[PDB]
Each structure stands twice: as C-alpha cells, then as structure tokens.
Amino acid sequence: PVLSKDVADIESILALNPRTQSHAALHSTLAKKLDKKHWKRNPDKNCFHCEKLENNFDDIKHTTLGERGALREAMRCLKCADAPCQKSCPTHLDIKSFITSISNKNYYGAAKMIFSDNPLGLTCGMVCPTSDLCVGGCNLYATEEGSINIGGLQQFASEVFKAMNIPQIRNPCLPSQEKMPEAYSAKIALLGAGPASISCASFLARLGYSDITIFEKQEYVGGLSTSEIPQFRLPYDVVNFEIELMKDLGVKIICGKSLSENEITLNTLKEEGYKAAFIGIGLPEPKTDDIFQGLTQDQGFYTSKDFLPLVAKSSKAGMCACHSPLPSIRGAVIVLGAGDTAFDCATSALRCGARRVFLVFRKGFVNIRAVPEEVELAKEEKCEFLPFLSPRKVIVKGGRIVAVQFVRTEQDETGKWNEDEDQIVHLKADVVISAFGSVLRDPKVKEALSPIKFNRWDLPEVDPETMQTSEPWVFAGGDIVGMANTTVESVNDGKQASWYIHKYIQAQYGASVSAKPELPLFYTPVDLVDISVEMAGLKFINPFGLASAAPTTSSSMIRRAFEAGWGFALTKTFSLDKDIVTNVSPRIVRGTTSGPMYGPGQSSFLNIELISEKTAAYWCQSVTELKADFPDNIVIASIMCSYNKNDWMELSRKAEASGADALELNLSCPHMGLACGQDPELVRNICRWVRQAVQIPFFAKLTPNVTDIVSIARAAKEGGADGVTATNTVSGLMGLKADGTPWPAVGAGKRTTYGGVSGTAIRPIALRAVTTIARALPGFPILATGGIDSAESGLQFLHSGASVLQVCSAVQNQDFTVIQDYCTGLKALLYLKSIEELQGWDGQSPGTESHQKGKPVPRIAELMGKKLPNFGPYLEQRKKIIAEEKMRLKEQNERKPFIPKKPIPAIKDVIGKALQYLGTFGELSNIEQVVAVIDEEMCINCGKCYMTCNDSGYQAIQFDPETHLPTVTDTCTGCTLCLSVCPIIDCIRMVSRTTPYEPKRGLP
Amino acid sequence: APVLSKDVADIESILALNPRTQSHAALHSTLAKKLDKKHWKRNPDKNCFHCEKLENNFDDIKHTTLGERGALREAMRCLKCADAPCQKSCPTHLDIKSFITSISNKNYYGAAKMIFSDNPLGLTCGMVCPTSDLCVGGCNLYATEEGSINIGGLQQFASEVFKAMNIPQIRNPCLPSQEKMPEAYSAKIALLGAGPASISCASFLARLGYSDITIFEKQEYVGGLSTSEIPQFRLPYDVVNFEIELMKDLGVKIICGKSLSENEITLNTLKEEGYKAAFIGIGLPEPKTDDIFQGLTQDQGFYTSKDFLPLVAKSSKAGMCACHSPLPSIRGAVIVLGAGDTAFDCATSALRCGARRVFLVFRKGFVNIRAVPEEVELAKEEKCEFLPFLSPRKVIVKGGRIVAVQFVRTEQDETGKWNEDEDQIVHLKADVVISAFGSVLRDPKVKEALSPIKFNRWDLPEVDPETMQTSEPWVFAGGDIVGMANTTVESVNDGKQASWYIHKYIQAQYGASVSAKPELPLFYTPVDLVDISVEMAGLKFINPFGLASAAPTTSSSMIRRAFEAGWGFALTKTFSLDKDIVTNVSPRIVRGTTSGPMYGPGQSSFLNIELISEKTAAYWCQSVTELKADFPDNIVIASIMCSYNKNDWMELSRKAEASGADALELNLSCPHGMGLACGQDPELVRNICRWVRQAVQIPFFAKLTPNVTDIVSIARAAKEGGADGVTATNTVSGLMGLKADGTPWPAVGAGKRTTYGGVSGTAIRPIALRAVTTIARALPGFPILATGGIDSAESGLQFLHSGASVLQVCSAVQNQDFTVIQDYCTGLKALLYLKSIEELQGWDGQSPGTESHQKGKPVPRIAELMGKKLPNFGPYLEQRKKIIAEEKMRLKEQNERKPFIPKKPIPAIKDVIGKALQYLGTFGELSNIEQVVAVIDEEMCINCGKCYMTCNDSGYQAIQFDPETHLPTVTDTCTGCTLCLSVCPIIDCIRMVSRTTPYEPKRGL
C-alpha cells in the first residue's frame, strides 16, 4: 500500500487540522448568525435576565487567580523603582518585591512581604478597591494591555501560605519573654474585633507586648469582613485564618462584652489597671430615615445592618453557633443607595431568591459612590439602576409593603441638589433595603467614651498622625474615626496607632523609643532555617553571590550588594597594568531568544564587554576595604593574564596580598580554539603557576565552548585548583536587522564580533556542565553560573553538585534586592521538605486541582464525564446543573499547624542528590512506557495538543468538532509533545501503559 | 588615598530612589496617604464628575488601538487555535489564527493579505467591529484570567502597516490576460450605493475578472455611513479612502450624483441600457421619526441623527467634501433619544461641538441597551448621563429655541409589555434635542425604482438569505437595506455572498457553468510575484524552507501533507540499517524552561531524548520513491546514520540514493572509539564523508553538532572528505532541569531516570547563527543548510544573510503546525520586496520606524507640550489636557494616495546570501574611538525606572530619576554599555547616539 498516504481512519482523525485555503470562504450572514451562539463564551448583550443565583455563594470576583494565571501576570509587572503602586497602597506594601517573589515561584517570600505590612493581607487582596488605590497608580496603565492585577496577585500568594499551614512566631531577635522589661507586660485593651483592632493588636504583639485583650460585642470576630461582606466576595475561612495568625502571638479575644455605659467604659478600664486602650468599634448603627418609621422585616423592610448579617450568618459556616436559614426574599426588591453597601445588598438579594432587583439613587450614574469593579458585579447580575429619585413614602397595604413613591431630583447652578415635588414615580416592590451608610448613635456608647473630645461629625477626635484621642492613653482607628472607608485604611489606622501606643506605654514606664518609627516585620519558623554552606574551607553565610560581571563593575556596587545580604561576590576580572583594556560600545544587548518581549525577565543578554577597565591597584585596595568592613562576606578576586608564568604569579600574589578570600582564574585570554581555557594542557599549566604562587584557594572559570568540559575541569584539578566555576558565557550572535547589520553595531562601519550569551537561555548548558563535572569529579567543589534567577533554579544547581550559586543576568534584569527573595525562597524550599502532609507539592506549588480560570470546578455527580465544555449551549446546561445543586443543598442544611516530622535539611544535605537519577540512555527502561491523559474539566479547547500530535507526532488525538474536547486514543506513544505545548498547567498528565507497547515500524 | 569602594556624595544622591531591602514595616498615616495618592494617579478618578474638554477634539478614542510593541505581545499570547471559534464567529470568516500567527512572526504583509482576502474593508472593520458580540465573543482565551484576544486591535494594526507601505492591489496573477477573457466578463454590471455592501460586492466581482463594474452613488462623497456618520474619532476618513482606492486598483468605476429613483436610475432604465445585473446597496437612507417632533427645526435646536452626524463629519473629515465647513455650534444641554450605536455617537460628537452636558434618554432600562458595552463605555467615560424609562411627550419652545422636553415614565408588565404612566412626568431642561431612533427606507420614488421586486412584511426588498437574489433573478441586494444585520462586517459579507451568485447568474446568461464549490479569489499585490526560489549544490528549491529531520518528519505521510501545504523541501527522520534499529523511551520531549513559567504558544525551546527513526529503511526508501513520484519539484533529502564502519555507510547510502532521494544528509550523532560522537572528531568525519562519496553520485551534506570546541575544523574535514555542504547545526546537549525534590524531567520508569538530551528552538538560535557565520567565513561558498530556532521569515533571512542557502525548521512546527509555511513564504517575499522601495528605507524590515506614542497612539506634536516635563499621570496629566484642549480651540479659530514603485529590481535570495558577513570581524576591528551614549525620549517613557535600576546595580550610576515626575535623564557619566536600552519595556524609547563629549575610560586609580 501507499506508505506515504494516511489510511481513511487517520484521514478522519485529521479532519479539523489546519490547512491553508486557496480561496476566500463563502458563508451567508444568516448561517453566521445561527452558528454564532454555538461558540459564545462571554455574556450575551441581548440576554436581559440573570442566571439562577439562589443560594449560590460561589466566588464572583473577576480578579481571582490560579498559579498559571498568577505567574504570567507577576512576570508582566515591570517591578518598578520608587513604584507608584506602593505609594498608593494605604499600608505601603512593597508590591515590587512581593510580585518579584511570585514570578520567582517564591510564594512564601511574597506572603511574608505582604503580611509584614498588612496583617489582613488575604482579606485585602480579595476586597481592596484597587482601581481607587494601588492599581490606579500602576505604570502599566500606560500600555494597551493596562495595569497589573495587584489584588489577585496578593490573594494568590496569601492563599498559598494559608494552605502551607505555617504559624506566625515571635520576632527571633526580641529578648526572651522572661527578659522583656516590665513595660511590655502592661495591660492593653482594644474595643471591637474588626480590621483596625486586629491590626493594632498584631503590631503591638510583634513589638513584644504580652497582655493584649480585644473586647468584642458579638459572639463572632472579624467585624464587617464577617458580618456584612458577602461570602461570595470574602470567604469566612479567610477571616478565621488571619485571626488565628494573630492569636499565634498571644492576643486574647473575649466575646460578648461591650463598650457601653453599664458595661465596659474608659473609666472602668482605668480602674482595672489597663494602661492604654484602642477604640476600633466601627459605626454600629444604620443611618435611617423617618419615612421608614416603624416598618418591620415582616412587612418587607430591612436596613442594610439588618439584612447583610442575616445572609452572612447563614452562608458563613462557623460565623456563629446556630445554624440560621437564608432569608425568605421573594419578588421585586428595591435597594436604596449607591455605595459599596447598596451593591452588596443587591447581589445578596439575588442569593435569597429575589426575582428582580432595583437600585435607586438620589443622583445620577456619574455620581455613584462605589468603585466601578463593584458596580460591575451588580450590572452583570442584571440589576436595574434608577437614577435621580428620592424616596418619599412607603405604601403599605394589607400589612405588606407594595410600593415606594419617589420624587425626581435635579442639580442646578452651584450644582445644588433639589427635589421636584410635582414629578413623581410610583415603583412597585415587595421588599425594600436601605443602604444609606452607618453612624454611631447609641448614647450609652458615646457616654462610655467619656471624657474624650468629639468633633463636628460626632466621632472621636484624633490626631491624624498619632491616632491619639484627647485622653493620651486612649487611641482610635478605623470606621469610628471616619476618615477610612476601606479595610486597608482601617488596617493602616491600627498599625499607625500601634507605634504611638508603644511610645506612650514606654514613656509611662520611664523609657524612650527610637525617633525613627520601627514596626517589626512578619516572621515564621521558615525564617530560622539555616542556609549557610562551607566549600573549599570557606564559610558562606548563604550560597548566593554576584558573578564576575557588569553588577561588579565597581567596588561600591559590591559594597551595596553586601549591604542587601549577598553572601559573596567576585570582582570584575582585572589584569596587570600592561594588559589594560578599553571597552567599545554599544556592548550589551537584549537576547532575541524568546521573541519580541521587552522589559522584565529578558531570557538572555549578549555582551562584547572585555575585562575590567579599572586597574589592579583599584581592585586590590578595594578588596582590602571590602574585607575589612564585611569580614563575613566572601570576596573573590577574578584575574586574567596572558599565557605567561611570571605574570600569573605576579597578579595572583598581588590579589592574595590584598586580603581576597579566594581567586577565580578567567581563562578567556587567547594563547582547540583560540582561548587558553579551551586547551587542557594550558589549563593545567596556568593552574600550576597559580597554585605555587598563593596559599589561598583558587577556582578555574571554565568555558562551556568545548567538546568536553570534563577534560578541562580535570586539568584544573590536576593543576591544583580547589574547585572550578561552571560556566562562562556561551559563544553566540544575537541576530541581525532586516538590512543585514548586526546588533550590537560599533562605529561608522556598523561592525561587530562574536559575543557571550548569558541568562536563562543558557541554563540547560550550564546544568549539564555542572552535573557532568560532579559525576566525573565527586567531591571537587563547583561554583555554578548560568541562568540562576530564583531560589528554585538555585536549588537545581545545588542538587546537581554545585555548592554555591553565582548570579549576573538576574540582577541586570532587576537590582540587588532580589537576594532577599532568594534567601526566603531557599529557606521555604528546605523547610517544606520536612512537612509530611505537603509531600504532594512541587516545591512551593500545591498540586493543581481542576480549575476553570483558577476557580475550583464544582465536584458534582451530575456533571462529571458528561462532556460539557464551558461555552455555548453546553455552558448553559452547566449553569443549570449547578443551579439545581445549590437548591438541592439548601434542602440538606479547625486551623491546626503542620509541625516538621524530620530534620530540616542543610545545604550540605541536598548537594548532589539529583545525580542518582542521571545516567546513560541504556539505563532508561523501554518497558515502562507512558501515555497522555487529558483532564477535560481543565481544557480551554484550543486544540494545540491535537495540532502538535498531527504535524509533529502520531495523529493519536481526536478533537470533537462540536465540543472541541480532545481525547488521547490508544495509538499514543508517550512522546509527551502534547503535554509540552498545552497552555494549562497539568491539564495533560502522562500515566503508565496498561496495554502492551509495540513500536510502529512502518514495514516489518 | 580615599575610600575607593564607597560612593561619593554625588552618587549617593543619584542613588536616592534606587531600591533597597527594608528591614522594618513602613509607617505612613492614612491622611498622608490620601494626600499622596492623587500625585500618582493614572486612571479615571472615580470622584471626578465631568470629563475633560473635548471641543473640536477628533483624536482617536478607541480602547482597542495597538502600536507595534503592544501588538507583538498580544499576537504572541493568542493560542492560534485549531478550527478556531473566533473565526466561526466572524461574519466574513477571517482566518484569525493565520493572521495573528503572521503578526507574531513580524509578517505584517501576510497578515494584511490574509485579512483583505476575506474582507476588503479589513482596516475599517478592525476599527469599528463590535467584537464582543462577534469574533472575540467566541475566543477560547476568555477561559483564562487575562481574557480574550484584542482581535480587532490586531486586525487594525496589520492593516495600518499595510496602508503605510503603499502597495496596490493587482488583478489575480494566474487569471488569463484581460484581452483573453470570455465575453461574459465584459457584462455590464451596476451597483447602487457606494457603502460597505457595494464596495465589497464590486471588489469581489473584479477579483473574478469582470471588467465593467460601475457603482452609482447618490452623494458627492463615497463610503456610505463609514464616511457620513461614524465619527472621525472612531474611524478616520483616510481609512475609508485607502480601501476605496484599493478597490479602484481593480478598475471598479464610481459615479457620484446619480440616484436610484423615479425619473433617474431605475431597474427599467438599467435594463434598457444593457446592464446585465444590479446590486442594491443603498442602505436605510432616512431617519426614523416621532410625530411628537414634527415641525421642529435646526434653528430651534432640533436634529435627527441623519441631519446631525453628517454635519459633524463634513466638518471634521479632511476632504470628505471639497466644502470647508464649521462645526455645528451645540451649546448648553443636549438630550439624545435612543439606545443604539447611533445615539452614543450623537452623544460623544455633541461634546466635540461644545455641549456643556449630554443626556442619553431611553424608552426602556439600562438592561435593554442595544449598543455593545465597548460602545456604551465611550459615552460613560466622557460623563454622559443616562436616563432610563422615559418616553417623550412634549417639546417646549420659547423665544424660538427649545428650552425643555417633557417625558412620561415607562414601565414593564406582567407579560413584558411596555406601558406608559400618564400621571408620572419628567420635565427635563435642555437646549438641543437629537433624535437617534435609527433609520428607515421610506421614499416612495426610491421604492418605485425597484419595481417589480417583491417587498416583505417590513417593506424591505426580499432576498433569499443564501444567494442574496431578489425576486428578479438579475437583481441582488445586501447590506443595511436587507434588514438582517447592522454591522459593517455583515454588510461586507452580504456583498461577498452576492458576488458569487451574481457571477453564477451572469455566467449562466452567457451559457457557461460555474463550480459547484464556491471559489472567491484571494487578495493579491505585486509582493506576491516575488521569486523566492534558490539553487544549492545543483538542486533547485522552490522556496528555501524545509522540514528538518525530526518530530514533524516522523511519518512519510506527514511530509506529504507538508508538501501539500507548500514546504520547499523535507528531510526523513534519520534511519539506519536493520541491524541498527532502535526503540524509543517515553516521556521523551519536554518543553523548555528557558523563558520561565510560560505555557502554551511559542515555547522558547524543547529538550528531547528521542533516538533515530523507529521505522525501517525499507519503509523510508519506498516512501522517498512515492514522495518523489508525487512531488517531483519538492526536494527530499534522506537523513541516514551508521556506526563507524565503511561497508555500512556505503550500503545504506546506496540504498537511499537508489530510492531516488535528491540528496543525503549524514547524521554524525553515532558513537565510536574530541567526544564520543563521530561528528565530534574531524578525522572520522573526513573518513565517513570519503566513504559515502565513493559510494553515491548524488549530493550529500554532513550534519554537524554544536557540541564541539571548533565547528569549523569539523566542517572543513567534511569538505575535504567530499561532502557537498553541511547542515549546521544539530541540537545542543543540555539538562532541562529538575523538580524541587531532585527528580528530572523527563523521567523514565519507576526509577525516575534521565540522560542528557538535545535543546532545540529559539533558545539555541544564537549558537546556530554563530556556527553558520563562522563556517561561512572560513569556508566561503561551501553550501550551508541552516537549522536552529528559525521560526519566521525575518529570522530565516538572518541566516541567509549569514551565509546559509536553505533553512530547516523543527521547533516552530512543534509549536504550531505545517501551515506556518504560508506565513514564511509571504513574509520572505515582502522582506525582499521592501528592499526595492526608496520611500521605506527608515523601516527595519516590515516595521515602520517607531514614532513617539503612549499606549501606541501618537503624541500630539504641539510645541507648548514639547519638553515641559509633564509625564502622563497625576497633576501633570491634567496640565497636558489643558494644553491639548487650548490647541484644539486655536485650530477651531483658524479653519493624494499614489503607490510607491520599486526603483531597484527586487533582490533574489542568491543576492542576499552572506551580506551580513562584511560586518563581522575580530574584536580589534571595532572602533573604541567611535563611542555612544544613551538618550531617552521622555514622550515615550512609562516611568518605570528600570533603566535607572539597571544602570545603578549593573552599570555606571549615570541616570537621574526624578522623584516627582519619575522621568529618567542620562547624564555624562554614561559609557554607552547599552544595558538600559536592553531592559526598557518601550521599543525605541531609548536610542544610542554618537558621543559628542570627551570619552575617557574610568580607571578607578
């Protein structure tokens, strides 16, 4: 038969494969109208009714992210200097740093950075109104693709940390609890357990206070986050987690106790010996209006303070004791108001069963209080918005509300707002919910704050800088002070106050505090993991250092690097005065190795830079000053001589005399190629010259541009090197413009020469070189260089046989502060090895569960294996099946931390551990074969697996023409190409063949 | 002697905003925060209640517009789906996957060619299509957090670049010559109405070869609504003109001032005068009207959309008319009645005319708005007010001006039927009322001219929805007049559908039949006649692109499909003698980690531990015979491998030659015995080559590994040994990486074992390019087949420029599929074509020179703006706005397209081979006298400070970064190292210029 033609079955399997067309298509406008609905993913602008939402408390936020989505977006962020997003965060979170840790897969380092400045970091990730805060200042707003999803990035990192189940701890550098001065034992009260108090009590705890007590009116803690923000925007378990974090530091919570004249008052606190008090009780009561005088919830009337807690209590498991049921809401619902609260009233009304919801405002669309992302929630649930209407009368017939009469309003001159009594609207409805805001009105509570001063707004008056009321020992914060109306501002009030509280307590015990404010960061057991390592007789405080390169151009930069925490550094390579060089320019260019992506995370650089332009005398003096001031940081002098015995002997004694802890020999000079480093016998001889000139250790810097790097490592060891650095850059050319001229291009003649490629493009090459040397020379020290940009990539080199990790391109891409991500990242990776119940994880990434857009797919009987992708009529059936399960369920009414159960490994215990899995081809099994399996619930229906198997594989995948779901068939050979191009992490997995493996021989 | 390793005061000060690790939580009061937030704000302020002044401001407001930076990013994001749902959702069935693929490859010609093949109004549509109700509505990436592709922005970008090249449309080159057509193609054809429907209809008829096509148009202007009503700030008139001029390139004739109407043109008069077929494309020419407005005039303040939108257009669209023309002076409060596209365009245009305030008023509610959300959004962001549930009752006129309109509340019953409530009124003050209820066909003399075609229930001409034929067989109709659609693209498609059956009908009237299968022709330009063939080692390649010996050539059945798609040549997967037959493991091909955790399209490398073919030599030799028999012009190169054994290489090469391969390729991966592979030792390569040469007479190429100290020594040995060329290069030995627990990937067996593998793809391109360059330099004229990370026409041209003759591809196919060959071909043609165009030498290939932009829209060239140090945020952005507005008002008080011709002949491939080698040389051949310094275009900056951070911690501390404006300035410390330019997210925002000042190296001591 014709071997080069597909048989009919394969022809059939290929029916949807791309082919190029030679004619333009012909399809009628009506055929297209009728097929359009089949493929539709997004809401239909003609569909005027909202999906059945009754009892559905599923997450509706547009900003939620999963791991895949979070990595892409973290990689997009430009990680800006003096970032404006941080300037616009009310708690000043280091957004650059924490997004940088997410792009490095260091979710622990991200969460630590978030929680250091915001103890309610997960709450704020989910509910912050970022368009009015950090995101509205984002530089990327100036690009077509727009600002970064900061809130969803913050929420993703925090959720991972929550899932790691790691406790907060006391600051490891406080004195012991026994040895704290007596002032720390002072009795502190906080009133109210909302964000402001939670934050305030957190920060005092970090400073060392051991007797802190929050007093909360309700049986439940968390404030509005618990009692009013809907479960479908803020899950109750997020609040419980943040509270338990705080209780890890010893804060006590006593429920059932009120700030109120017959109960707790400032005078009673004074008499029981409390030394300071923080008022965070919020605004307990609803703003009301005479025209609703005396209407009951039976008749149909709620205030927002009556309604939202009813819903929250029955949707939020573990808010209270009781099970309560969802409020019976039926018919047409009018919500009065235009803020945050009115929009949560509207959407929570649909969850209780409302048929129609009307939002009615005093002014126009243009004037809506709330943020646009909050409005869009109501909008997409098809709430109707009625502007320019003020309520006048509620109509009650038969004991029930039946309508509300409004008058029309208009702005005049001045923009003066006037009601027009002649122009009326009679709006039929069954339930009315006023969402006019809130106030503190209860005279028993105002009198319990006696004697503190109140202002014109009838709120406690505070100094905006210190949060102190008129009584110096009483502070206040949050909604009750009336400047904040976000969670993150109330968090910030409690943080602001904590410092001034501390100042006041210390001064009451005769003690002074710093003039510069110093709130402690956030800490966990992770932070105590030891990541020091010892190599060739040096002790490194951590394994990360600056390679010999552009970041070590001047000794002042090394000095700043050591101040950020880098463990070690190489000088740029320097030489004898007779060999001094002069750079050309341009000389460092971006890598074209991942296509036309500009900005952060360049996958390579090319350089035609020569060695250092500064003299040996600058560098020698500089190593002396650096070793004097940083005795515990390793300094390594990189040196280069022509192939001359006296020169190498001179220059290495000089650099040793300066106090260098070690030397690094740069074998790039010309002299099996052109470089002394490409010829084993020249390597061995240069190393012998140096070995007998100096007593300190030295390392040969090996080039990867050789047939066999092992022969060059062995030569160095035979020459007397104490180790080898693997590897220098890869020889390369980064490309040409369309007209033929290169880049870089030097001078009038647009000339260039071959350069050195660095960055994550060469990491495969250096990893091979490190593992080849480690297998051939067991025990011989290796310094790794080549594409290390994270703790995670560093650990791959460690596992391969390296002991320390040299970095260049990742700093050129960013700045010296990535060391703090690298150190936290590596502590977390090692710590996580000791937790038994997280062994399903890859490093810091939890095992991927089936998601759609990073939201868990519903685990419902009636929905599995029944072939319903998330578009067209299929999606409509999904939502109908989901809606019925919510209804079925309504008719069917503890946080404990993981403890390590094995010692945490030190660097010395992981070095080399991958080598065991490496060997020859003949050591791999050809009996244990695999096949691809596709999780249809994760697929986004692109058909890339399909096309790759078609045109680079075995034609083994069927792509359904109506559902666009792929199925791997039994002709799969396990090549793994499909898994490798799929856009969804872990949507395709390889599993073991059950069936027998026969190779396709074409002809037997 | 002072402290060398510490920064002097000056530099400590330049470093003041550099990032530093913080060791404490920050303290900043809520008050200070509120106070500071406004300084940095980029986006609309939610507590700001009127929008900036727009008067006389016709600048682009579209949110979908893209510059080249942004387009390359968004194109690389598209998954380029099989059977893509976005295409199913486009009424003209554009091949979005192909045209986005082309954009990501920098082939803006092949993208525009793909768009215009299916849509002659491709630029207009890109700018105005309501994509959320069409193609983007169906996009698969909607199931990701970042969302669906900006397909419309991408369409508009490639179309704009194509407009910039000034290339004309040509009649299809493979058609007979004009003098050689059948008589039927001279049939006189008539189209009524120069709008999208007829332009598209006349375009496709002319592509089919009809020589005598006239559009008769009522007005003095052309373009229908795209000219007279869509605003200039959404659709610039020059775009309409460009697409009409493309049509006129095929000889379509346009006559203005001639109407379908009683006593002018009727179907009867066309029939008498010999016209053989007519297309009715006149749209819905009259406004839909309310009795409550009868008798109101423009001087009282009343307009319908049909009077008002053309008055704004004649004023703001340069030479729509030969009339100059002042804006309507629209002052005070404006009421616009309606909820479709028309009303939102009246609302936004009224602000350009000076309206203080605009009310859009609807009969129903916000839920029932007819425009798509993107169109609503434009009126929302300009602070129009929306009033729902009002129906108009009375217009009050005092002193000859409208002063108010009285409405009644509407509401919805118990059945969805829509009643008014007489006791519930709204009296809304206003000075101008603009009726936007839509459009109609009312004119009795127009309808009479269409006698006798049947009219339907809606009083519109009845057509069959498949054929667009009226009840008279020679008369077809399409577009708004049919009543089915109201988008540009659907009208374009009506005219497209009709043109096929019009052809079918005319051909029947002259006695000929047409295909059962519809066959509308593509779009062609002279770019398509470029020759990209090339001859190497005596073989003629129809184009230089071929499939490497690899995964895409696992089966000969795949090579067949590749040739069908157009690939110039292909290798077999490497095969051996029966005694050498291998068995692969699995898993064995893994995605690269070389560009981080990015998944899906465009992997930057792969790693494989795959062996040579598991199919036998018989299979491959019989296969080469069938392939050569069915594809005698496509080149088949048998790739072979033996151990180090003379009889074996001779037996197997003779078997492959006797199968009829055009050439052989020796895979020197094999072990025996300067490495383990034969390919790593020049002596063995020499001997193997000699052996093969004495055995066969066909050409043969040696495939080199890059895993050598000196690839030249190996190439040279293959040449000494007799080979006709070399293939440079095979994969690079690497280890793709480990999982955090130390296991590898791939991992084989329950042992999780692995071995070194080969890296392919664009990550290894700099290595392959250096290899190609260095052989081409040392062995000039010795043919080179290039391979390593070639994935576009642009990067294939780099290799040709560097000395290769033909270009092998593997990873770009694994990343996509065999159809990229269409993109590579049209891309190479366009690159070669552009070299002959004098007016376009500032471009780099198909990339215009970058113009200073924000979000890819051009920066107003106003001198009061130039160098005032006003970044685009906070209070500086408010000042930019005040200056641009005052300029627009200055302009208010002071009231030709011909194609470029090649001036050289168009280069052939052999003319460009090697041309980059004249720039390569040793290091000592570079000037260290001719130094540069970086220079920053503050107008392009996005204030990120990455240049600043790079120069501080990797450079010379030479940039100042302003603490209030976050503008960088480069100082005279600059050495030109060029790292800032390389990290800048904005293309061409930093440029290197010749050092003017004194260049002294900084020596420390």
Ligand SMILES: Cc1cc2nc3c(=O)[nH]c(=O)nc-3n(C[C@H](O)[C@H](O)[C@H](O)COP(=O)(O)O)c2cc1C
């Ligand atoms: C899965 C796979 C299999 C390959 N098989 C061979 C082969 O059998 N013979 C060979 O000579 N080169 C083989 N190659 C190397 C390719 O032919 C090509 O040289 C390499 O992938 C570089 O081109 P690219 O960067 O376009 O992929 C293979 C590459 C891959 C990814």
Ligand code: SF4
């Ligand atoms: S806390 Fe809120 S404000 Fe701050 S960065 Fe986060 S999301 Fe933004």
